[PDB]
Design a protein around this ligand. Sequence first.
Ligand SMILES: CCCCCCCCOCCOCCOCCOCCOCCO
Ligand SMILES: CCCCCCCCOCCOCCOCCOCCOCCO
Length: 772
Amino acid sequence: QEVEFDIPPQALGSALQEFGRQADIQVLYRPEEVRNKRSSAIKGKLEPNQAITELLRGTGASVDFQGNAITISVAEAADSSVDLGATMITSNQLGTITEDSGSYTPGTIATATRLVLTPRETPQSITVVTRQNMDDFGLNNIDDVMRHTPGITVSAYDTDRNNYYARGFSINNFQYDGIPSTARNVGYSAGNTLSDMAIYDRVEVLKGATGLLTGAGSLGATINLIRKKPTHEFKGHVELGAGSWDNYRSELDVSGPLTESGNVRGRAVAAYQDKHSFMDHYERKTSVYYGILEFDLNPDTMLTVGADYQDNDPKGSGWSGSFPLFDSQGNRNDVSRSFNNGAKWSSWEQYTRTVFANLEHNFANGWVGKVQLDHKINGYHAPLGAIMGDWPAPDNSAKIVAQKYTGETKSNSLDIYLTGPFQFLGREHELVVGTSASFSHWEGKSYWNLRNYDNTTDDFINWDGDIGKPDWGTPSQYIDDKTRQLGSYMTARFNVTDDLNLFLGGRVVDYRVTGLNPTIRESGRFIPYVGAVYDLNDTYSVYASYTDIFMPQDSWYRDSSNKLLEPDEGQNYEIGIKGEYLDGRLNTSLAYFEIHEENRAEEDALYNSKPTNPAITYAYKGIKAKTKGYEAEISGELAPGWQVQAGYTHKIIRDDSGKKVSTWEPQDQLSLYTSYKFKGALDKLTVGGGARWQGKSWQMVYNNPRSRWEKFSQEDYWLVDLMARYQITDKLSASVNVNNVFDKTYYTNIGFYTSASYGDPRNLMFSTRWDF
Ligand SMILES: CCCCCCCCOCCOCCOCCOCCOCCO
Ligand SMILES: CCCCCCCCOCCOCCOCCOCCOCCO
C-alpha cells in the first residue's frame, strides 16, 4: 500500500536507487540503459506502482513487478536477441528481502560472490529458506531451519549442540549479514547451533567449497543469516505460542520511521521462550533482543548501527548424547525416549551478542561501496554433569563425569568492498573488490579437579538427574587463543556473449593463530574461483564451476614427528542445469558435484598403537577424500496459491583407500514442504504439510566390555509434518503445527562417545500472530 515519496529529477541511476530505498524494494537495472537518462519528479503519498511509473515518465523504460523486486528495462525497436544474464546493478546489496513475498523461493542473493545475482545466474548450488517458510512451519531457530533445509542432515552431539552436514562434511562456516564468524572449534562458536530466527529475514546456504567469501573455513556449505531491516512505513507484530511439553514462545517485532521525514528509521525485536522437553528433566529459557537504526546522511550515503543479543540457558544438559549405548557387561541398553543422562543442575548455557556499524555510499559511477564494523561476543557457562561410561552395572548403579568450562570470545571485524559495472569490448560487466580483517580472542577457565566428589548414582533405570553438584576446586587450565584472518578478494562477471557469463576471481588469505599452542601461520594463500553460466532457453541454463577452501588445522592434529598437518583443503567441481519459470516465481535445479579433499586429518593407528614421542601421544596423518554425488531441487509457485520447497540429494564420501566415511550422513535424502492457500469462501485458510525421508545410516562403535566393534544402523525412515493457519481478521491469525505426525521413533546420534540420542516425538504448537 501507499508510501511517502520525494525523489527529485536527477540521473536515472540515482533516482532508481533512492526509489528502492524509499520504497523498501529491490530495484534492478542495466547500467548501459539508464546512462544519460532523467527520472521525472515524484512527491507525496503514493502507491509504489503508481510512483515508479511517474518516475519513469520520459525515460522510455518498462517495469517488471516481481514481488519485493522490480526490474527496469528499456525496450528497443531493434532488439535482435536476448541477454538474460545482462549485467544489472542492484539497490539492495544483500539481495531481495523475503519478508511478505508469500514465497519459498528467493529473489536475488549475493551469497556466492558478493555480486547481487539470482539463483539462475549463480554458478553454485544455492538453497534458501525464506521468511514465509519459517513462518508457516514454525521454524523458530537455526536447528529448525536446518532440519527443513534440502541437502542438510542435522545430527546431535548433545542436548545443546547439533551438527550439520552437507556433501560429506560438518558445516562450520557461519555468517551474519555476509560477515564470517570465527568457528575454529566450539569455544569460538558458542551459540551458533542456537540462533533464534526472530531477527532474521532468511537463512541462505551455499553448498560446496566456499573459500571466496568465507576465507579459511570448512568444506561442504556456508550458512549465511540475513538480519531483518527497518522499513519506511510503520509495521509490527506480536506472536504468542504454546506447545508439547510446556513450550511457550512470545515475540515482538516493531518497525518504522522515527522522524517526520523518515531519514532516520528503526527496527526492534524481542523474543522469549521457556520450554521443557520430551527428555526428562531438561528445560531451556531463551532470550533475544535486536535493535537497528538507519541514518540517511544524505540521498546516497547511509549509516547503520545495530546490536543483537541472545541467551541460551538450559538445565539437564548432557555432555554427549542422551544415554550410553552399552551397559557394564556390554549388552545394548534399551531406554525410554524420555531418558536424560544429564544431571538436574547440568547446564551448557551459550550466549552471543553483536554490535555493528556500516556505511554505504552510492558513487555516481553507478558504483556502491560499503564498510562494515563488528564487535562480536560468543560466551559460555558450562557446568556439565552426566552419566557416562558402560553403565548400568549389574546392580543398577552408574557413574557421572562432571567438568566445568566457562569462557568468552571477543571478535572484531573490518570489511570493505567496492562493486560496480564496467565496459570492456562493447559489453557490460561488473567487479567486486574487497578487503577484510578479523581479530578474535578466546579466553577461558576449565575445572576438572573435583574435590571430594562421589560420582556414583544408585539407580540407572529411574535416573532423574538427582545427584549432588561437586566442589569444582580451583581452575585446571586457562585458555588463550588469538586468531587473526586477513583477506583480499576480487570477482569479475564478464558478459561474454548474450548467453555466456564468465566468473573469474579469488581471495588471498593470511591466517594466524597465536597463544598457548605453538604459532599457526599461513601466508599469501590463493583461493581460486572459476565459473560459467550458459543460457539455452528463456527457461534453462547450464553452469560449471571450480571453487576452493582451506582451514589451517587445529593444534592437536600433529604427525609422527610433531609437525602440524598442512591445512585441510578441498576443491568442489560442479556441472549443472537450472530452470526458471513464471518470471522468477518458481526455480528448479539439477547438479552433479565432486569434492576433492586433501590433507584430511587421520588418526595413524600403527604409531598411536604405542607412541614413540611423548610430545605427540596421538599422531595424525594427512590423507585424501572424494565426495561424489548429485542434487535436485525445486522451490516456489506450482500454481497460484501453491508453494513448495523440495530437494533430493545423493552422496558417497570415500577416502583414497576406498572406505566409506561420514556414514551417519545418509547416502540418500529427500525433503518436501508445501502449503496451499484456498481461494473463494476459504481464502482465509492456509493448509500445508511436509515430509522428510532418508536412507540407511550407520556408525562403527567399540563395545569395550566385550572387546569388539559393532555396526549400529538406523533403517531409512520418513518424518511427516502438517500445518494450517486461518486469517480470522485483517490483523489477527491462528495457526497449529503438528510435527512427526506418525510419531516415528528414530536416532539423531549413535556412537558419539559411545552414546545415542532420540529425535523429537510427535509434537504440537499452537500460535496467534497479531499485526499492527
Ligand atoms: C553503540 C551501541 C548502539 C546500540 C544501538 C541499538 C539501537 C536500539 O534502538 C531501537 C530503535 O527501534 C526503533 C523501533 O521503531 C519503532 C517506530 O515506531 C515509533 C512509534 O510510531 C510513531 C508514529 O508512527
Ligand atoms: C502424543 C501426542 C498426540 C497428540 C495428537 C493431536 C493432534 C490433533 O491436532 C488437532 C488440533 O485441533 C484443535 C483445534 O484448536 C484450534 C486452534 O486455535 C488456536 C487458538 O486461538 C488463539 C485465539 O487468539
